[PDB]
Structure 1
Amino acid sequence: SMNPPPPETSNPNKPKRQTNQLQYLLRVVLKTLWKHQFAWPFQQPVDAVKLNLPDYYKIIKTPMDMGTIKKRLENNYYWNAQECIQDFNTMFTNCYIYNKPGDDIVLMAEALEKLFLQKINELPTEE
């Protein structure tokens, strides 16, 4: 089972803008999560070939990872903060759906999600 193409990070047909919230998501939120000790398995798409997980993309049909999110933020792919927040939430949810409660990868996702939620509670009001 080969890997799918990664999620899109550039598309001239999709509208986009910069907002103060999206700039916070890159400079504060992504930056903090990216340097966490447990970030590395989330820094690129799940490579189901390398991991010998041929079922992964039979079960997870909306893949997401922080490397994709980072590129989307650096490329100003998004129209609003909610789109980007949804990508982080999809990344976490996928991990919790695919893996067993208590698996190491789930504990690593949960630590990142705890930091994410702190930072999202501090999301600035739109200017």
Structure 2
Amino acid sequence: STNPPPPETSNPNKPKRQTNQLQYLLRVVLKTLWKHQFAWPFQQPVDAVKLNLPDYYKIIKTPMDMGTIKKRLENNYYWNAQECIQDFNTMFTNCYIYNKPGDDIVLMAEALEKLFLQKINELPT
């Protein structure tokens, strides 16, 4: 089954913004999570062809991944931290929707989500 086009990482109709919190989400939150041993499945859009998940995009209609989020942050695509946080949460939720409790990929998402929540608990002012 085909992959859809990946989510946009720029949008000229959308206003950009740089905030201390968005800087921090890239420099600290994203870039540290990225180095985690369980980060690799989330560093690019789900390749449903390669992974032999032909029903992935029949189920997941708002795909998200850290590769896309990283590019969005580097673009200053977001208006605020909450928009970016929402993308992280979409990424985790997608994983829990498509997969089942106890699955290896779910254990990976669960661990990353905990680390993510740990790091966004306190943001710059």
TM range (shorter): over 0.9
Which SS does the other structure have where 2:23 is aligned? helix
Task: Please state how far the C-alpha of 1:16 moved relative to its aligned partner.
Answer: 1.1
Q: Deviations over 1:1-60 (max 9, x none)?
A: 100000000111111110011001001100110000000000000000011111100100
Distance in 1 between the 2:33 and 2:73 partners?
Answer: 14
1:77 maps to 77
Two-structure CA RMSD over aligned residues (Å): 0.6
Detail structure 1 runs of 4+ shifted over 6 Å in the superposition: none
Which SS does the other structure have where 2:83 is aligned? helix
Q: Which runs of 5+ in 2 are unaligned?
A: none
Aligned-pair identity in percent equals 99
Normalising by structure 1, what TM-score?
0.96
Which SS does the other structure have where 1:101 is aligned? coil
1:78-97 equivalences under 5 Å are: 78-97=78-97
Distance in 1 between the 2:51 and 2:112 partners?
Answer: 21
Distance in 1 between the 2:92 and 2:17 partners?
Answer: 25
Task: Please state how far the C-alpha of 1:124 moved relative to its aligned partner.
Answer: 2.1
1:119 maps to 119
Task: Please state how far the C-alpha of 1:123 moved relative to its aligned partner.
Answer: 1.5
Distance in 2 between the 1:31 and 1:90 partners?
Answer: 18
Normalising by structure 2, what TM-score?
0.98
Distance in 2 between the 1:12 and 1:60 partners?
Answer: 26
2:55 maps to 55
Equivalenced residue count is 125
Which SS does the other structure have where 1:78 is aligned? coil
Distance in 2 between the 1:20 and 1:123 partners?
Answer: 8
